[PDB]
């Protein structure tokens, strides 16, 4: 959902901001609940790592929107290029992370 916002029009600043804000806050809520699921161990679990990486991806999507907005009406070709490149660099990277993660942990 946080990567869906790359396909919205950059003239729609409030919409993509709603996207980023709502997704990062949802990630915060999910992390809090999942860390409330299990006992109070002082170390990180595999689910904690998965959640931290997903939060990083969502926050990076919001930061990409901020960069695109910072480069709109000042250098529009650059913001268009950034959106176009992100549209393929985020989902591929998340697929690669999911592959590596599940391969590492489902073998143990």
């Amino acid at each position: 959902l946080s990567q869906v916002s790359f396909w919205l029009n950059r003239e729609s600043v409030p919409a993509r901001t709603v996207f980023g804000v709502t997704t990062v806050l949802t990630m915060t809520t999910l992390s809090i609940s999942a860390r409330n699921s299990l006992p109070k161990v002082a170390y990180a679990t595999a689910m904690d790592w998965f959640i931290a990486v997903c939060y990083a991806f969502v926050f990076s999507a919001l930061i990409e929107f901020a960069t695109v907005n910072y480069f709109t009406k000042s250098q529009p070709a650059r913001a268009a290029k950034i959106d176009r490149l992100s549209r393929i660099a985020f989902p591929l990277l998340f697929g690669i992370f999911n592959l590596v993660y599940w391969a590492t942990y489902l073998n143990r």
């Binding site: 600043v13 409030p14 990062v24 915060t28 002082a42 926050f59 907005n69």
Partner: protein
């Protein structure tokens, strides 16, 4: 309970090695730092009684709290700062950022 120091005396057998297994205790949220054995007498209206005291020092582990409360708060504050890069003419976006972070 019933016998005073005229009837009964308490002492630790070994006097420092009387308590074993403290280093072999694994608490999930705490670490035992020190334990102490004490031998004293207490006084109530009914007389003076022997007492032994076994005390443990417990230092809390903060990793769980780094993962539970501190890091979400730091992340929400940084999310709040994200608004400083949006242009100031955009009112709905900056208001959404600010209101969401404040209320969260």
């Amino acid at each position: 309970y019933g016998y005073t120091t005229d009837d009964i005396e308490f002492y630790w057998r070994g006097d420092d090695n009387a308590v074993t297994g403290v280093t072999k205790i694994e608490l999930p949220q705490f670490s035992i730092v020190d334990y102490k054995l004490i031998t004293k007498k207490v006084v109530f209206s009914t007389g003076s009684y022997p007492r032994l005291s076994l005390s443990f020092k417990l230092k809390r582990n903060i990793g769980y709290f780094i993962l539970q409360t501190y890091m979400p708060s730091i992340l929400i504050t940084i999310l709040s700062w994200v608004s400083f890069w949006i242009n100031y003419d955009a009112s709905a976006a900056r208001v959404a950022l600010g209101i969401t972070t404040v209320l969260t």
